[PDB]
């Protein structure tokens with residue numbers, strides 16, 4: 001009927017890995033930094049380890065396993081993959097450590113040393129990842145700079161598949177109900193009708209690029225999420241970032257068309273940003289890449 | 304008779320420069336970071352500005368002018384030069400700002416990222432500076448890693464001429480009396496007889512190199528200055544730094560010979576360290592330039 005999912009769900013023993021330190025916490029639970037050491041091999045693998053909490057909510061435990069299902073079912077250099085789970089009191093997700101954290105925080109606390117080459121290359125890698133997920137028939141539903149991680153400054157990957165959904169062969173869209181999805185990153189049709197498609201992800205990709213080009217600005221910074229529906233319907237969109245040529249900003253705008261099919265496909269976004277990456281300073285203007293009358297004392301010879 | 308010193312002592316107005324911040328303080332007085340802006344030109348020169356204190360000791364005011372005399376009388380890329388003085392309540396010395404501070408502190412707080420190329424190049428530059436001072440008939444009498452400043456990581460200069468003395472044409476050595484000179488950097492003949500020569504500076508150069516090669520260790524760390532005389536007479540010298548090949552350590556040892564003329568001349572030290580700088584990893588072994596079984600998760604494919 002459909003292609004059987006022959007992904008392997010690896011079950012790992014707790015004694016095989018060591019939590020070095022906590023990385024984060026909040027509503028999602030807690031994430032740890034650690035080393036995984038398979039007993040047989042002579043290897044030590046840096047890993048991130050995620051668990052919920054001391055309590056076990058019926059609905060919440062089910063959803064971490066859904067997240068494991070999707071992460072176990074993906075294999076791509078620009079997508080984060082599940083290494084395994086550990087069946088402790090509460091289930092643990094084990095993944096490759098992405099030491100430099102989320103891309104949102106990275107662009108924020110490195111503004112001054114991020115060049116056009118890096119920005120446009122990140123855009124290419126995210127598009128490649130999203131394109132892979134489209135081939136795999138997966139709709140992410142939560143693509144944002146915050147859900148892209150940095151393995152190295154020159155290599156990023158998409159993660160956070162907690163809202164992701166797999167589409168059938170004879171199925172073009174997913175219909176949500178529960179809601180509670182980040183509104184400022186989702187397409188109008190998703191806000192209006194709970195419709196999610198690969199083209200809905202393209203909208204979110206558009207917003208993600210805006211975040212990168214503004215070095216981590218909050219979209220619609222002074223606007224509550226209730227109003228977002230109205231302003232999009234009016235034709236209002238995120239503004240052109242200072243560093244963005246009309247060339248780049250036109251790409252971003254096309255991702256936010258009302259007609260979903262009029263938006264570009266991820267495969268096209270790979271091409272366009274890739275072309276731009278060959279001559280990056282032609283497409284992004286960044287003053288790096290408090291006075292200009294300053295001169296060093298030994299280029300000032302005594303008159 | 305002797306060559307007339309036609310150096311120009313430039314007198315600068317206080318209104319021409321602005322103190323941005325204090326850099327240091329202690330027994331020597333205070334040093335400021337500032338901008339010098341000659342009224343005529345369209346330039347802004349980063350400068351260090353040194354003054355004594357609110358009080359004016361007769362003997363202390365004279366000595367800052369002696370320091371100005373020598374700094375005004377030197378012109379070399381590896382020596383710090385006086386830009387001018389300002390005749391305020393207490394006289395101010397104005398020099399080129401050396402933004403990265405003293406080399407001693409620089410090797411200490413950058414151990415992990417200082418390679419053999421940088422160390423040996425610094426040795427070449429200091430020897431060039433000291434050789435220039437020898438041609439200029441000047442004995443520094445206080446050469447140490449602390450009295451070498453960093454303009455950029457790849458360009459250093461000798462400074463702190465407060466103890467410096469000019470020798471005559473028919474004069475090979477200076478005879479001190481007052482004393483109170485840093486004992487752990489001075490030659491045995493200087494400790495024993497108050498004799499200072501260009502070869503006494505070579506001893507101090509030797510110690511300065513030891514500081515650099517140990518990334519800013521204190522010489523004779525657990526020894527009081529009273530004992531230093533004895534141990535040098537016994538034949539005890541500073542130990543071989545871990546990173547130092549016998550080749551480099553032999554240079555250091557030769558600077559600490561009892562016979563002053565058996566020590567190398569600065570011009571020879573330029574040559575030897577310069578040769579070594581062409582193949583720096585042959586002469587200094589540094590592990591950069593907590594596990595080795597570590598492997599990244601995507602070079603570990605699921606068995």
Ligand SMILES: CC(=O)Nc1cccc(-c2c(-c3ccccc3)oc3ncnc(N[C@H](CO)c4ccccc4)c23)c1
Pocket residue numbers: 023024025031048049050093094095096097098099100101102146147149159160
């Ligand atoms: C959205 C968010 O805050 N994600 C997050 C939170 C906490 C840690 C990480 C994380 C980091 C990280 C490292 C240093 C500083 C800050 C963050 O590195 C990571 N490498 C892999 N996965 C990470 N976290 C995701 C959470 O989406 C994750 C962990 C384990 C299993 C699945 C996913 C991570 C990522």
Ligand SMILES: CC(=O)Nc1cccc(-c2c(-c3ccccc3)oc3ncnc(N[C@H](CO)c4ccccc4)c23)c1
Pocket residue numbers: 326327328334351352353396397398399400401402403404405449450452462463
């Ligand atoms: C031995 C010592 O502590 N020297 C010292 C003390 C304070 C400041 C400086 C100094 C610095 C500096 C900058 C940032 C951090 C730390 C130090 O930069 C400098 N550039 C030029 N001269 C300096 N000081 C010498 C004092 O020997 C100096 C200043 C003005 C006139 C003559 C000499 C300096 C150097």
